[PDB]
Here is the input.
Amino acid sequence: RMKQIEDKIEEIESKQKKIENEIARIKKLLQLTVWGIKQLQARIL
Amino acid sequence: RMKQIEDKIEEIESKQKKIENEIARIKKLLQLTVWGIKQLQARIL
Amino acid sequence: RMKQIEDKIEEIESKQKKIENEIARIKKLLQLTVWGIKQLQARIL
Here is the structure.
């Protein structure tokens, strides 16, 4: 029974790491879009 | 004590689903903005 | 084994709060990018 709980915790932790990885990728892409908007507006203005 | 562990695990799993859902929605909108920036670069510049 | 479980649960909860705070920040900046793309389109095209 202790292992069943421990396995659950492992699964959650693993899922949390994947989520953290996803959020980092999202932040990078979001920063790219910020840069692209900045670049577009710069070339015009 | 075991009750608290079981309850907290359920809360964590629910919050994780909430987070995954928020991430899904963020990703779709981010893909839209990437597309819009691409269109503006071409159509303006 | 119960203490170990409880410590990991606390760690997971702390991380979930951090993640929720990251998502809040991402959402705000993403809303600004949506507005900026809208603005460039409106002003020029």
User: Anything to note?
Assistant: The interface with chain C takes residues 1-2, 5, 8-9, 12, 15-16, 19, 22-23, 26, 29-30, 33, 36-37, 40, 43-44 of chain B (CB under 8 Å). DSSP finds one helix and no strands in chain B. The helical segments of chain B are 2-44. The domain at 1-45 of chain B is CATH 1.20.5.170 (Single alpha-helices involved in coiled-coils or other helix-helix interfaces).
